[PDB]
Paper text:
NAD+ synthetase can be either monofunctional ammonia-dependent NAD+ synthetase using uniquely free ammonia as a substrate or multifunctional glutamine-dependent NAD+ synthetase (glnNAD+ synthetase) using glutamine as the source of ammonia. glnNAD+ synthetase catalyzes the ATP-dependent formation of NAD+ from nicotinic acid adenine dinucleotide (NaAD+) at the synthetase domain using the ammonia generated from the glutaminase domain21. Here, we report the structural and kinetic characterizations of hsNadE and a direct structural comparison of the closed and active conformation of (1) hsNadE structure in complex with a synthetase intermediate analog at 2.84 Å resolution and (2) tbNadE structure in complex with glutamine, sulfonamide derivative 1 (5′-O-(N-(nicotinyl)sulfamoyl) adenosine; SFI), and PPi at 3.14 Å resolution. Both structures are snapshots of the enzymes in the allosteric state with the synthetase active site loop ordered revealing an exclusive rearrangement of the glutaminase active site and the molecular tunnels.
We co-crystalized wild type hsNadE with NaAD+ and AMP (the synthetase intermediate analog), and MgPPi, which activates the glutaminase activity in hsNadE by 12-fold, to obtain the crystal structure of the hsNadE in the closed conformation of the synthetase active site and with the activated glutaminase active site. The co-crystals of hsNadE crystallized in needle-like shape diffracted up to 2.84 Å resolution. Two molecules are present in the asymmetric unit as a homodimer, whereas a tetramer was found in tbNadE structure. Analysis with the Caver program reveals an intra-subunit tunnel forming within a chain in hsNadE structure unlike the inter-subunit tunnel found in tbNadE. The ammonia tunnel is also sealed off at both ends and the glutamine-binding pocket is inaccessible in hsNadE. In the ATP-binding site of hsNadE, AMP and MgPPi are bound in a deep cleft as reported in the tbNadE structure 27 with one Mg ion coordinated to three O atoms of PPi, to the main chains of ATP-binding site residues including Val360HS and Asp361HS (ATP pyrophosphate fingerprint), and a Cl− atom (red sphere). In this hsNadE complex, the ATP-binding site is fully protected by the closure of the P2 loop via three crucial contacts with the ligands and with the synthetase residues. In the absence of a ligand at the glutaminase active site of hsNadE complex, the Glu176HS side chain moves 78° towards the Cys175HS–Glu45HS–Lys114HS triad compared to the herein described tbNadE complex and the other previously reported complexes. In addition, this conformation of the Glu176HS side chain blocks the glutamine tunnel and clashes with the glutamine molecule as shown in the overlay with the tbNadE–glutamine–SFI–PPi structure. Interestingly, in hsNadE Trp179HS-subunit A is observed in a conformation that restricts the entrance to the glutamine tunnel, and Glu176HS is positioned to prevent glutamine binding.
Residue numbers in the entry:
A (entry chain A), B (entry chain B): 3 to 698
C (entry chain B): 3 to 353
């Protein structure tokens, strides 16, 4: 009848065994206080999901087991079934596993059967899928575990648990949406509870597909579904957004946070198993298509999941899943990201080159949002967060209440004007900093620039001129770039010495402000301020950035943003001749951010090369453009793209948000020395155009 | 009786279909002129091996076929069997394939059955292995091919080719390295000739493994074995080093270049099939197993490998494989990789910061080596090299004979001294430049440094001091780093404007000079000159570098190097107080380049975390060090490594040389925000140390 | 973790049982003193490889067993696993065998599955290949052995050895050179250490082939690989040139002499089993095939290859194989072959 189960989101850290252990323990202790008899944790939670090439290392395996032993001998784990994740090597093959134990015995080790090998995922690099479906083998335990557990071997493979009162089965992360998912046969076999341990990272706007899936599955097959997921940054450019859930028969009973500053969040629910049994009768109490397939092996477990609590235990009522707006998503994720980055880097704060333009502004807003979250958290009684703030600012007695106050201690904004900067942009940056609370620095680079160009003249005997002073296209560009790069040099100097100049220990993380759209076209200066330490908006669309900044006005009460939004998007690096005004980035690029986004998505999402893309747009923009015209747009896109790709190889690491990122380290593997005339492809395009231009 | 076969190495280029088509045609034409009736190409040669995520694009598939259709309708391919590679989608699964055609008819498509998923390889990201052994399906041909070939379908799978006189089998690359390789069962079923198309890249010293393996195989199994490989840079960090070979019954019959400036290099041999047959007939255990061997599907082909060429057509005689010394390898690999960048980037030359030290010196030697190579190639009658040069140099009449004259056209060294630089280092740089013939630039950064520091003072009211002037540790470092990044600002300014100042069109690629040992430890300044466009020595050991440079003294007649070798490895950026001499980078790092090299190899090559590494060293350095000491060495390494790993994320792409490269984009994936205290792991280490101190 | 293993080259002599016995004992004693818990010998080392038509003689079989019984009751062989070779008649078929024993108990008898029948070799004249792959029969022990060992039978066939810490397989000589060698399927089924007892003779310039092959194998397949061989003249035209080796994951860890005037030369190495395991764990195509691999019969053994030696027992470091020039080979081969004639012919010199 009535059972009480727990799932959870943990902020795990790659190879951080000590912390990882304490987090797992805490969740189990929490679940037990709430009356749970089964606890589900995230995929590979013992070592942290993102260990990458450390999985090749045997030490990883070893410590994981030492962590497992600690769990097994811990008095908290008594009388609750615990499903943890670690790597495990069986017969010289490395598997991504679930280790399920109860009262100092291992019940079953259950290896993953479908591995993620797309986008940021590459599990086949380190793990093998279990291929012997509906079968188990005897796994031989480490003497370390034997001595403790008093078992020689345990079942290893595709099996389910049978207890005195129920039948629980495992579905690991992506097995949930893999063709022919375990949950189908488990359902058929009569499995009433299905646990899914995830490690899925944030992706702007796609939170609902996870929820929908679990929902549909429970709706279609009946049953309780448990989903646990990592939450936070585990040591790289991903943010895991654990929307841990508990679903039954198509309804949701517990909704876990997508972004929060909690290291441990536990969901429970009290459900009557008979609701499953009667909901399944409601559908098909009959037989099926006559399948006669090999049935699931069964691990007998001497334990009752439901135990006497009924007399008081309130049944969980169904709930509606509340989603975040896309702007709320943006204001929360990169924000919580930046918080883990700061706290785990053990760095003294951030250094933000603030230009008075939209992106640098958005970046500033993310920090302010971070501060708010921290204040919220501290108010909420979050000891970990309080501990951390106190450690970051060095003040034992400190207690952030006003976000502007915390911000000041944590953020240093820096406006670096050139000879041609307007008074307006300088002002806007000054105002925005004033409003969020940051320590603002305003300086002029021109003395350093004059000096560099002096060195050049001194040695070549030649003086480059700006385009407006009769300079060549090359000279103009070079000059612009020098200023860009001097800014970067200065940014790092302050990162390294500004706190020093204020009488205080420590150094700052440099933050970048490239957006995903310009990153793709390479419309940036190699090694200017586009290269920093971390970039939180690197993966966000320009349009979304504007959207996010306009949303910040009212949510954070920052009026300084209006002028910033209204101002013309221009880079004041070159003097303006009489009769003309500044050129906008969109004219500079030779395409609007809108249409740039389309190329982006057609390229990475829809997997189109130039010919394919030419054909798509030809129809999409059939009214607006002519065949010759789209050819030119596409050609212009691919050439600029290819010419600039090398800029991508060295680009600052970015929070992952859009599934159309051009990021080269993990998500978008590509050449960087292309033939930039695309002779063959472009010829195909021409032929098509010529063919169409034969119509009357 | 006698058959004439060809294999080759092509300098393919990712997505360069036009180019790739022309090079394949050339190989086939060269093959025919030399009398071959079979021609084998490299792995995925139509599209070029390294298209990475473009493999997801239908356009890659489509254009590959268009190339194929071109090959099929081409007169040159008449009466020679052609083994060509491309990706194929079959039943909506994407495979790495060989396509064998003859006289406008596709004979068979052979999919790869084992993929490479380690190191720089990750075929599983985009392809699936064919897994039905000795089995075949019908491939439905694209309409375009049908209209040309008048075929509806062709066999797709694990099949062999039967001619009137022989039986030909395919082994694709990594299949040769798998435990139960195809060549075993193939040889037992009477396949006489085995063809292997590879696409494997350079690794210092590992050339013999490929040779020994193919030789062993034909020795153990009998038969002729052909290997083809890409040669050169196809668009990324890798150099494919085509050691294409022909081997029979354990002897080599043709050895292809490892590094050469040739786009197309064809090997042919004339062999007697009767030698194969009698070699096999002499192995009793083989024959006992061959009269019981499981059969391969055979595609019957109306063709004779041995024609009316028999008339005294001279049988090929056995040869000894000649190898390169490790220094010759270094002298030739990155050199060719550099030529390929220069010509395929359509850039006007290189800009090399030259410090008067070993590594930058090495980089200079590579460029000179390249120059010699180009000169040698031109003297050989190589028309594409001569064209390529004239294009780079914009003078259609130019003929590089002297290596020093070419060098001055395409290289620009740049010495950049600080206030503290010594006169010696200046002169070493200058003397090296004179001797290789580069255009040398000598300047002082001090004016620019003062200007930047003046900016900092104007805005903070504080002035940083060098440690020798009582500055703090941080001040001293900030100061050193500033100078360092200023050098980078200048480097790019000259890269962009130096030719302009000399009244010449174009720009330069900036070369880096980070070695693989410093890259590992993070012993470099983020965004100093460590950050360039490409780094030809970023994957090479400090010890190999010295060895290389010392080799260059006699090989290239460059005496300036001796002083460069003999001089103390010091970075003159800070002033030294008297009573004290300048600190070497080895005491700066806190470890010798030697012990560093060991950490790096134990790390990547032996897959070792800090506990494992401590254990290994403890035994290795048992005489030299005490366990307490070993722990400190290991902890210091791991500490430094992980505090600095972020420097890897934005670091300049390096030519891949060692298999212990710490490169983060492809070869060595790792997190970049570690818990740098390594609590768990260091605890385990201290436990062992205590345990060892108590007992004895 | 770390295991210490031994292999050797013995100057055996056809039918010189007394002598052959003493040399085997010496190797095992040398092995134990150097800390090994496993000792591999050369092919047919009890009787000496080149007995030729004496293999037809029951006496060869009988006396081989008497030697074996001697080894079994010998104190020196306590607590080390010994791989020793002799011919065995089983169900009235004569096989070239490895006999593995431990502490007065025979663990398994592994018959040769491919014989050499070319050049100077002609094993088919006197032996039969074992042809039931991954299969085992009961060998009925001779009474003499039963009374000593208190065993009635022992497994006879294509089986592997499982200890507490590891899995050991046999490849006999020419099996390494066959197309579908045992080491392939063995490595996929988790055999960590492969032992090879050979008896192959000198051929000018061909030494590298043996080295390259064993190296290639452990490179491609992972694992430790031990090779033993006779060294010297056993009674005829041939000189066995024992290039005994120890190799792991594609590197050599011990190189034995090709020509030397030593009767017994033992190689030991100390290796970490964890290095094998992680080397294999890094090969995706291998692991995809290993999770689908057909199983070998296993003889369970109540023994640990890795003992309380772990205490700073120094791991063996990789070495480069040093070869002889063709002239050094000529200078050394026939020279040793000559010393062996002189001393074994009990003659006073040469004319
Ligand atoms: N295939 C290839 N592989 C490797 N490297 C390659 C290469 N092709 C060129 N390169 C090299 O890469 C280097 C590129 O860097 P660099 O020479 O500095 O120039 P680059 O970064 O290419 O040009 C900067 C761009 O930024 C834009 N801009 C201007 C002003 C402000 C802003 C802003 O929004 O902040 C942007 C401007 O319109 C311009 O197109 C060159 O040295 C070039 O030789
Ligand atoms: N976990 C983490 N994730 C992301 N970023 C992290 C981080 N931890 C620190 N950071 C940040 O990274 C930045 C590091 O750069 P920066 O502050 O400039 O300093 P950094 O590059 O760390 O220090 C430079 C090193 O170069 C050496 N050096 C000196 C002189 C000459 C030479 C030579 O051979 O050329 C070398 C010197 O001994 C020193 O150790 C800092 O802003 C820091 O806050
Ligand atoms: N005036 C400025 N002050 C501070 N940072 C700037 C300034 N201008 C540009 N940046 C930085 O440079 C990048 C944008 O380049 P740009 O479009 O030329 O303004 C972003 O990473 C900005 O943070
Ligand atoms: N005096 C110099 N002139 C030109 N390049 C230098 C100089 N010093 C350092 N570099 C560059 O900076 C890196 C080495 O840093 P450092 O060890 O401080 O000399 C290499 O990439 C060099 O090319
Ligand atoms: Cl163990
Ligand atoms: Cl069952
Ligand atoms: Cl400090
Ligand atoms: Cl803007
Ligand atoms: Cl804007
Ligand atoms: Cl200090
Ligand atoms: Cl130009
Ligand atoms: Cl040096
Ligand atoms: Cl040096
Ligand atoms: Mg903006
Ligand atoms: Mg140097």
């Amino acid at each position: 009848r009535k059972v009480t189960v727990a799932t959870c989101a943990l902020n795990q850290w790659a190879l951080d065994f000590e912390g990882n252990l304490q987090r797992i323990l805490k969740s189990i202790e929490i679940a037990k206080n709430r009356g749970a008899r089964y606890r589900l944790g995230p995929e590979l939670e013992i070592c942290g999901y993102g260990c990458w090439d450390h999985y090749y290392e045997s030490d990883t395996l070893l410590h994981s087991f030492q962590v497992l032993a600690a769990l097994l001998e811990s008095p908290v784990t008594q009388d609750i079934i615990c499903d943890v994740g670690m790597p495990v090597m069986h017969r010289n093959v490395r598997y991504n596993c679930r280790v399920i134990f109860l009262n100092r015995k291992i019940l079953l080790i259950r290896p993953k059967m479908a591995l993620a090998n797309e986008g940021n995922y590459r599990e086949l690099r380190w793990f093998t899928p279990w291929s012997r479906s509906r079968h188990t083998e005897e796994y031989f335990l480490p003497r370390m575990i034997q001595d403790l557990t008093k078992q020689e071997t345990v079942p290893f493979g595709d099996a389910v648990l049978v207890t005195w009162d129920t039948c629980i089965g495992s579905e690991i992360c992506e097995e949930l949406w893999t063709p022919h998912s375990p949950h189908i046969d488990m359902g058929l076999d009569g499995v009433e509870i299905i646990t899914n341990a995830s490690g899925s990272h944030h992706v702007l706007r796609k939170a609902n597909t996870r929820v929908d899936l679990v929902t549909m599955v429970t709706s279609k097959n009946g049953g309780i579904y448990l989903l646990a997921n990592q939450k936070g940054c585990d040591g790289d450019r991903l943010y895991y957004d654990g929307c841990a859930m508990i679903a039954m028969n198509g309804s949701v009973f517990a909704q876990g946070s997508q972004f929060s500053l909690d290291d441990v969040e536990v969901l429970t629910a009290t459900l009557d198993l008979e609701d499953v049994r009667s909901y399944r009768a409601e559908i098909s109490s009959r037989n099926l298509a006559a399948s006669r397939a090999s049935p699931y092996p069964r691990v007998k477990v001497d334990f009752a999941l439901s135990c006497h609590e009924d007399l008081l235990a309130p049944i969980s009522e169904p709930i509606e899943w509340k989603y975040h707006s896309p702007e709320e998503e943006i204001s929360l994720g990169p924000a919580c990201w930046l918080w883990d980055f700061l706290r785990r880097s053990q760095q003294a704060g951030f250094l933000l080159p603030l230009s008075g333009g939209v992106d640098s502004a958005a970046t500033a807003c993310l920090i302010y949002s971070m501060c708010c979250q921290v204040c919220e958290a501290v108010r909420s009684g979050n000891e970990e967060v309080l501990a951390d703030v106190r450690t970051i600012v060095n003040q034992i007695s400190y207690t952030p209440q006003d976000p502007r106050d915390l911000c000041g201690r944590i953020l240093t904004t820096c406006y670096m004007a050139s000879k041609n900067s307007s008074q307006e942009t300088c002002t806007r940056a000054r105002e925005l900093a004033q409003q969020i609370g940051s320590h603002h620095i305003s300086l002029n680079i021109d003395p350093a620039v004059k000096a560099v160009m002096g060195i050049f003249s001194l040695v070549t005997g030649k003086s480059p001129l700006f385009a407006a002073h009769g300079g060549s296209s090359r000279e103009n560009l070079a000059l612009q770039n020098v200023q860009a790069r001097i800014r970067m040099v200065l940014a790092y100097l302050f990162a390294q010495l500004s706190l020093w100049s204020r009488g205080v220990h420590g150094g700052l993380l440099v933050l970048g402000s490239a957006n995903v759209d310009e990153s793709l076209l390479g419309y940036l200066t190699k090694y200017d301020c586009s290269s920093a330490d971390i970039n939180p908006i690197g993966g966000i669309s320009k349009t979304d950035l504007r959207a996010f900044v306009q949303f910040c006005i009212q949510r954070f009460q920052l009026p300084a943003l209006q002028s910033i939004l209204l101002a013309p998007a221009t880079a004041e690096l070159e003097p303006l001749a009489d009769g003309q005004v500044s050129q906008t980035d969109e004219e500079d690029m030779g395409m609007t951010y809108a249409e740039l986004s389309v190329y982006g998505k057609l390229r990475k999402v829809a997997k189109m090369g130039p010919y394919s893309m030419f054909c798509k747009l030809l129809g999409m923009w059939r009214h607006i453009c002519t065949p010759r015209q789209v050819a030119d747009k596409v050609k212009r896109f691919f050439s600029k793209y290819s010419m600039n790709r090398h800029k991508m190889t060295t680009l600052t690491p970015a929070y992952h948000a859009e599934n159309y990122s051009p990021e080269d380290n993990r998500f978008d593997l590509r050449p960087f020395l292309y033939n930039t005339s695309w002779p063959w492809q472009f010829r195909c395009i021409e032929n098509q155009v010529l063919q169409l231009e034969r119509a009357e």
